[PDB]
Design an enzyme around this catalytic site. Structure first.
Site, PDB file in Angstrom:
ATOM      1  N   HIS A 115      -4.352  40.460 -46.762  1.00  0.00           N
ATOM      2  CA  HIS A 115      -3.109  39.507 -47.337  1.00  0.00           C
ATOM      3  C   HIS A 115      -3.625  38.218 -47.416  1.00  0.00           C
ATOM      4  O   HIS A 115      -4.546  38.333 -46.077  1.00  0.00           O
ATOM      5  CB  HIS A 115      -1.147  40.276 -47.326  1.00  0.00           C
ATOM      6  CG  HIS A 115      -1.325  41.491 -47.904  1.00  0.00           C
ATOM      7  ND1 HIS A 115      -1.070  42.040 -47.437  1.00  0.00           N
ATOM      8  CD2 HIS A 115      -2.079  42.183 -48.483  1.00  0.00           C
ATOM      9  CE1 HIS A 115       0.548  43.089 -48.070  1.00  0.00           C
ATOM     10  NE2 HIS A 115      -0.890  43.241 -48.712  1.00  0.00           N
ATOM     11  N   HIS A 148       1.914  48.685 -42.434  1.00  0.00           N
ATOM     12  CA  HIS A 148       2.163  47.628 -43.093  1.00  0.00           C
ATOM     13  C   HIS A 148       1.597  47.533 -44.469  1.00  0.00           C
ATOM     14  O   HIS A 148       1.606  47.602 -45.673  1.00  0.00           O
ATOM     15  CB  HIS A 148       2.307  46.191 -42.797  1.00  0.00           C
ATOM     16  CG  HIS A 148       2.475  45.047 -43.464  1.00  0.00           C
ATOM     17  ND1 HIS A 148       3.442  44.843 -44.258  1.00  0.00           N
ATOM     18  CD2 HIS A 148       1.165  44.452 -44.256  1.00  0.00           C
ATOM     19  CE1 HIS A 148       2.865  43.534 -44.691  1.00  0.00           C
ATOM     20  NE2 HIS A 148       1.371  43.458 -44.688  1.00  0.00           N
ATOM     21  N   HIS A 195      -5.642  42.625 -41.759  1.00  0.00           N
ATOM     22  CA  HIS A 195      -5.337  43.230 -43.673  1.00  0.00           C
ATOM     23  C   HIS A 195      -5.728  41.855 -44.547  1.00  0.00           C
ATOM     24  O   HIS A 195      -6.270  41.342 -44.252  1.00  0.00           O
ATOM     25  CB  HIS A 195      -4.048  43.689 -43.227  1.00  0.00           C
ATOM     26  CG  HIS A 195      -3.748  43.275 -43.252  1.00  0.00           C
ATOM     27  ND1 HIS A 195      -2.524  42.442 -42.904  1.00  0.00           N
ATOM     28  CD2 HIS A 195      -2.142  42.734 -44.546  1.00  0.00           C
ATOM     29  CE1 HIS A 195      -1.465  41.930 -42.458  1.00  0.00           C
ATOM     30  NE2 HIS A 195      -1.623  41.915 -44.831  1.00  0.00           N
ATOM     31  N   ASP A 240      -2.333  36.477 -46.296  1.00  0.00           N
ATOM     32  CA  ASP A 240      -1.376  35.713 -44.294  1.00  0.00           C
ATOM     33  C   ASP A 240      -2.605  36.219 -43.942  1.00  0.00           C
ATOM     34  O   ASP A 240      -2.750  35.304 -42.754  1.00  0.00           O
ATOM     35  CB  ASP A 240       0.150  35.910 -44.759  1.00  0.00           C
ATOM     36  CG  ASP A 240      -0.052  36.782 -44.215  1.00  0.00           C
ATOM     37  OD1 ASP A 240      -0.368  38.561 -44.597  1.00  0.00           O
ATOM     38  OD2 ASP A 240       0.931  37.704 -43.256  1.00  0.00           O
ATOM     39  N   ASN A 296       7.096  42.640 -46.326  1.00  0.00           N
ATOM     40  CA  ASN A 296       7.149  42.982 -48.283  1.00  0.00           C
ATOM     41  C   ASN A 296       5.898  44.367 -47.975  1.00  0.00           C
ATOM     42  O   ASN A 296       5.223  43.929 -47.436  1.00  0.00           O
ATOM     43  CB  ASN A 296       5.452  41.788 -48.326  1.00  0.00           C
ATOM     44  CG  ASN A 296       4.600  42.075 -49.885  1.00  0.00           C
ATOM     45  OD1 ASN A 296       4.997  43.767 -50.563  1.00  0.00           O
ATOM     46  ND2 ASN A 296       3.652  41.557 -49.399  1.00  0.00           N
TER      47      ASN A 296
END
Ligand SMILES: C[C@H](CS)C(=O)N1CCC[C@H]1C(=O)O
Ligand SMILES: [Mg+2]
Ligand SMILES: [Zn+2]
Ligand SMILES: [Zn+2]
Length: 231
Positions: A85, A148, A83, A87, A179
């Site tokens: 983000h 998410h 995804h 990380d 988150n």
């Protein structure tokens, strides 16, 4: 056995062998007064390695490549970010500079661009609709639907029965939904159900953060998401 966030100084990366030809990589970062771990995956792809997700930032990802070189010694030729983000894509530029071909779905690339995050070079077609799956060498990539994040992919290693849920799946010790800024809380349980339905044979389930477990992590994630929804 699995390295915890108290055992990895920020800047270092550990590798953990899950099954033959499958490792997780574990890195850490400080955020808002706490230290958090983050997992990615490494899958042996013949005589090369397929990397799933960066190690959460340029410095960690440089450490990841050095640790892979030291401990496995096969080239990382492709990386998939699951995804948008940091990380997952933070460190893409480090991978790219090291000759790694970086991949993400068009949905991830679009969202990374909106966020101003690093953008993988290649676009993974065939993943735009919930329930879409594509093969990518030794893994299957599956878009279970928004959870998410709207772009979150899961990764299954059929030879090892390893299901990598990324940040759509929570470890058992996580009691909050994490988150949720980019989450689709309404669809998350349905997306989890799609994962359960497609990989009921999974023996190892790897969350995006924290300790691996089994398929129980899916029901746990559903419970945590429902509890957050009902706050
Ligand atoms: C960078 C990751 C992406 S799933 C994240 O959002 N984390 C990891 C630390 C906590 C939480 C946050 O920043 O709110
Ligand atoms: Mg639980
Ligand atoms: Zn995330
Ligand atoms: Zn995450």
């Amino acid at each position: 056995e699995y390295p915890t966030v108290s055992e990895i100084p920020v800047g270092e990366v550990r590798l953990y062998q899950i099954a033959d030809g499958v490792w997780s990589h574990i890195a850490t970062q400080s955020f808002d007064g706490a230290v958090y771990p983050s997992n990615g995956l490494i899958v042996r792809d013949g005589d090369e390695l397929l990397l799933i997700d960066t190690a959460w930032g340029a410095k960690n990802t440089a450490a990841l490549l050095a640790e892979i070189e030291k401990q496995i010694g096969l080239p990382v030729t492709r990386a998939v970010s699951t995804h948008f983000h940091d990380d997952r894509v933070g460190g893409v530029d480090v991978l790219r500079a090291a000759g790694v071909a970086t991949y993400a779905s068009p949905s991830t690339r679009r969202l990374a661009e909106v966020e101003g995050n690093e953008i993988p070079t290649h676009s993974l077609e065939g993943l735009s609709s919930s329930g879409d799956a594509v093969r990518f060498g030794p893994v299957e990539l599956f878009y279970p639907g928004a959870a998410h994040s709207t772009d979150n992919l899961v990764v299954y290693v059929p030879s090892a029965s390893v299901l990598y849920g990324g940040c759509a799946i929570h470890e058992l010790s996580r009691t909050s939904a994490g988150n949720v800024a980019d989450a689709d809380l309404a669809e998350w349980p349905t997306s989890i159900e799609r994962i359960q339905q497609r990989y009921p044979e999974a023996q190892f389930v790897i969350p995006g953060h924290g300790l691996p477990g089994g398929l129980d992590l899916l029901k746990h994630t559903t419970n945590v998401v429902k509890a957050h929804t009902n706050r």
